[PDB]
Amino acid sequence: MEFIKGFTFGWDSQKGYFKTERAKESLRLMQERTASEYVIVALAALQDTAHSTEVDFQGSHMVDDDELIELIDYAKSLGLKVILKPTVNCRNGTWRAHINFFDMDIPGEPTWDEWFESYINYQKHYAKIAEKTNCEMFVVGCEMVQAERREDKWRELIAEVRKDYRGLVTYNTDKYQEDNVKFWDALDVISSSGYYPINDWDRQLDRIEAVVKQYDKPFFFVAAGCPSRSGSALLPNKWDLEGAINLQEQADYYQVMFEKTASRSWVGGFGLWDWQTYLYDEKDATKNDDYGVFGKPAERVIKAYYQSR
Numbered sequence: 001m002e003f004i005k006g007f008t009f010g011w012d013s014q015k016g017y018f019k020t021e022r023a024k025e026s027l028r029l030m031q032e033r034t035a036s037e038y039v040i041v042a043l044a045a046l047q048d049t050a051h052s053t054e055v056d057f058q059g060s061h062m063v064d065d066d067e068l069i070e071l072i073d074y075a076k077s078l079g080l081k082v083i084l085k086p087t088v089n090c091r092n093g094t095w096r097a098h099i100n101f102f103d104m105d106i107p108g109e110p111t112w113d114e115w116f117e118s119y120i121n122y123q124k125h126y127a128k129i130a131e132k133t134n135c136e137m138f139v140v141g142c143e144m145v146q147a148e149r150r151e152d153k154w155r156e157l158i159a160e161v162r163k164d165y166r167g168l169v170t171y172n173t174d175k176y177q178e179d180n181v182k183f184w185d186a187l188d189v190i191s192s193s194g195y196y197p198i199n200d201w202d203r204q205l206d207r208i209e210a211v212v213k214q215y216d217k218p219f220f221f222v223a224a225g226c227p228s229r230s231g232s233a234l235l236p237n238k239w240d241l242e243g244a245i246n247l248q249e250q251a252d253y254y255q256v257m258f259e260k261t262a263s264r265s266w267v268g269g270f271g272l273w274d275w276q277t278y279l280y281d282e283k284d285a286t287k288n289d290d291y292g293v294f295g296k297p298a299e300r301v302i303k304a305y306y307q308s309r
């Protein structure tokens with residue numbers, strides 16, 4: 001598989017965002033300033049809590065099918081390939097990694113089968129969209145740490161997705177969880193949220209290597225990145241981390257990350273975390289403490305490295 005030079009887009013979007021021309025502008029800025037050849041459209045449905053069974057993708061937190069199809073078409077019209085990544089959030093704030101139900105089915109309690117039924121139906125709806133728009137890859141799940149043990153249900157879900165979509169299929173595991181998934185044989189690509197510390201890449205890359213070699217498959221970090229924020233380089237996943245603005249720390253993180261993964265041939269690309277739909281003004285970049293890379297010194301590290309591959 002070719003080296004995926006990718007960037008995540010659209011995580012901030014809601015109903016209506018993908019029609020506006022600000023969205024089309026942001027996408028062109030993203031491609032121009034980073035040299036990304038892939039866009040990872042990251043969307044999120046909602047369930048009430050980590051222990052609810054209804055997954056809701058029709059409410060206004062979610063873009064409508066028509067503006068999504070349009071945004072994808074527009075992306076491909078710019079020479080960008082498209083990975084579609086529908087995951088799920090909780091309305092009470094709980095990280096999806098905690099979505100969980102009892103092992104046994106208990107009378108009157110929510111069950112794994114009820115959740116997976118709602119979640120399968122959600123995935124199939126977007127797998128049909130991925131097929132009609134000829135997306136290159138489709139991500140059936142993201143950081144579902146406590147659900148990953150339910151292997152037969154993930155295998156059932158992947159089969160259901162293949163009925164609608166004939167392209168590449170992967171699953172996005174969380175950091176340090178690459179061997180927590182036992183259904184990699186059923187996917188085409190292995191991927192993880194590579195939020196590893198700036199000073200621990202060697203140990204982590206060596207662990208992941210041995211996990212990948214147990215399987216048939218290419219690997220890439222479908223998510224990776226770092227806020228421009230003091231302390232983030234050691235904990236790049238923690239989006240609510242409290243620390244002063246620090247653009248240089250974000251640039252150091254990307255420099256180190258590309259340097260360490262460039263020597264590893266099984267590391268097959270990136271879906272850098274994120275490029276916002278409603279991008280800030282480049283004048284305010286110097287005071288932005290978010291994952292965004294627009295107008296910041298890390299923007300040039302990514303452009304150069306992606307342009308070197």
Ligand SMILES: OC[C@H]1O[C@@H](O[C@H]2[C@H](O)[C@H](O)[C@H](O[C@H]3[C@H](O)[C@H](O)[C@H](O[C@H]4[C@H](O)[C@H](O)[C@H](O)O[C@@H]4CO)O[C@@H]3CO)O[C@@H]2CO)[C@@H](O)[C@@H](O)[C@@H]1O
Nearest residue numbers: 011044089093095142143193223236237238239240273291
């Ligand atoms: O309700 C009120 C006010 O809030 C607005 O929304 C929130 C929302 O409540 C929630 O906090 C949401 O969280 C984010 C977070 O900002 C990060 O982007 C985070 O990211 C991670 C992602 O989940 C994956 O782990 C990925 O791999 O790594 C990312 C970085 O770690 O994603 C969280 C959601 O899962 O942020 C928004 C806005 O900040 C709106 O509801 C608005 O309506 C209302 O006025």
